[PDB]
């Protein structure tokens, strides 16, 4: 029941015990769930006192007390956090990472994470002041399993915060120093650590192909692929997004996810009850069928075409849009035999069914798919049999009706198909 003035007169005194007792009373007030005097101690000018106590190597208890008090303030609004940063807390917390006392080191790890989590600006400050090396040191133990779960989680979460945000994204060299430890973490058995590491990777791969290249070069793929088959939704989700981001990259980068055995997990992902997973997995597949013929070939070899046909047919519209892209990319870069196989899997009917949708873009995608398929049929002189399949399932009526579509381009593609494969 101390007042802020009580804390001040104690903190500013030369009595060591009064300083520690005052610091502890401060921490307790800041912990209060119902109305903590954060602003009052800030205005009292206590931040600088707390930051200074962080350097009292001689008095470990006051160091812990002030680190906690500073953390409770950092964990607050994106204003109270700024006060802590301006008070010089960042470098002070960094020097406490090597503290022999685990509970003090953890407090520093937590504080640094909360601060870097504020946004891209603070995140870069934490990096600039050299937080990464000391942070990685704490994980440089032979058996990560020897670390207390709670301890490890805060560290992983903190590193993840150094990988988060994109305006701007973390400096490349900083990401490079963090990647190796991230890979090791993907090997841990704690779902919380795995989820956080996967999230971290998902942020690092969400950008330029150059950033993807680094993540791939650091060998994260084999592990992400294994997590793709995780049973935990909190893990699968970020692992899938990370793999999804990587295959938006170059064909070479995409091959690495194929080599890691990613395709073997999709029959399950594409049939996953969680529509979000199904949607993200189909989106991911669309980026793989957007690649080289040999890659589309591997999609074929893993028996994935039937699953895409399945999602295009039965599945939420949002997921069907991704499947439409997956099919059109396939018909666009695939060989004739690959296309013939697609038709054999019953792609025609579900493809037509979507030619009456309001999303003009999806119509154009599907029309280009039908166009590509007819080109393959031309090479085989089977254009006629394709026409009958299309007509027999009501697809011709839909193509004909699109000549009244508001979008000229859709009208032109419909017309062209009509005058080439339904002429007279």
């Amino acid at each position: 029941n101390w007042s802020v003035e009580d804390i001040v007169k104690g903190i500013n005194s030369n009595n060591l015990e009064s300083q520690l007792q005052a610091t502890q009373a401060a921490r307790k007030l800041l912990s209060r769930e119902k109305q903590p005097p954060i602003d009052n101690i800030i205005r009292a000018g206590l931040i600088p006192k707390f930051v200074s106590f962080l350097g009292k190597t001689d008095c470990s208890p006051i160091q812990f007390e002030s680190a906690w008090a500073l953390t409770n303030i950092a964990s607050g609004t994106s204003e109270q956090t700024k006060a802590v940063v301006d008070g010089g807390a960042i470098p002070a917390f960094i020097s406490l990472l090597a503290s022999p006392h685990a509970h003090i080191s953890e407090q520093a790890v937590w504080a640094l994470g909360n601060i870097a989590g504020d946004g891209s600006a603070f995140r870069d400050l934490v990096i600039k002041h050299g937080a990464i090396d000391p942070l990685l040191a704490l994980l440089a133990v032979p058996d990560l399993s020897t670390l207390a779960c709670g301890y490890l989680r805060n560290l992983t979460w903190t590193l993840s915060n150094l990988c988060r945000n994109k305006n701007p994204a973390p400096p490349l060299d900083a990401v490079e120093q963090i990647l190796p430890t991230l890979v090791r973490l993907l090997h841990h058995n704690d779902p919380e650590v795995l989820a956080d590491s996967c999230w971290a990777i998902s942020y690092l791969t969400d950008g330029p192909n150059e950033r993807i290249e680094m993540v791939v070069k650091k060998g994260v793929v084999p592990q992400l692929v294994k997590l793709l088959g995780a049973t935990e939704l909190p893990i699968v989700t970020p692992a899938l997004r990370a793999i999804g981001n990587i295959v938006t990259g170059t064909d070479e980068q995409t091959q690495k996810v194929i080599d890691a055995g990613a395709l073997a997990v999709f029959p399950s992902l594409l049939t996953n009850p969680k529509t979000n997973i199904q949607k993200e997995a189909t989106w991911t597949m669309s980026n793989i069928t957007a690649g080289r013929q040999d890659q589309i070939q591997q999609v074929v070899n893993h028996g994935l075409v039937p699953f895409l046909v399945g999602v295009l047919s039965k599945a939420d519209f949002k997921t069907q849009k991704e499947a439409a892209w997956a099919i059109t990319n396939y018909t666009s870069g695939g060989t004739v035999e690959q296309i013939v196989y697609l038709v054999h899997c019953g792609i025609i009917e579900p493809l037509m069914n979507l030619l009456s949708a309001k999303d003009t873009k999806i119509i154009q995608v599907i029309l280009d798919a039908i166009s590509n398929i007819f080109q393959a049929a031309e090479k085989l002189g089977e254009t006629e049999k394709l026409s009958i399949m299309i007509e027999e399932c009501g697809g011709l009526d839909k193509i004909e009706a699109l000549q009244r579509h508001e979008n000229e381009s859709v009208y032109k593609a419909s017309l062209n198909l009509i005058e080439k494969y339904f002429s007279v």
């Binding site: 993840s160 989820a195 956080d196 999230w199 998902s202 942020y203 969400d206 909190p234 989700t237 970020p238 997004r241 999804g244 981001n245 295959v247 938006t248 990259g249 529509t275 979000n276 949607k279 993200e280 989106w283 669309s286 980026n287 957007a290 939420d316 519209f317 949002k318 069907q320 892209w325 059109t328 990319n329 666009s332 870069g333 979507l354 009456s356 949708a357 309001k358 999303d359 003009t360 119509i363 026409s387 009958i388 007509e391 011709l396 193509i399 004909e400 699109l402 000549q403 009244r404 579509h405 508001e406 979008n407 859709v410 009208y411 017309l415 009509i418 005058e419 339904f422 002429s423 007279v424």
Partner: protein
């Protein structure tokens, strides 16, 4: 490239969400002004 980045930025604080469940709907038909000048061919049947 036929490659495309995700529609929405997925994060550890928005991953668990309902996606409105969009409806296919019907396409918009060209206006009368447009149709008066559009050449439209009938499709042959078998």
């Amino acid at each position: 490239m036929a490659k495309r980045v995700a529609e929405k930025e997925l994060t550890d604080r928005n991953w668990d969400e309902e996606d409105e469940v969009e409806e296919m709907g019907t396409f918009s038909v060209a206006s009368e002004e447009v149709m008066k000048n559009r050449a439209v061919k009938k499709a042959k049947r078998r």
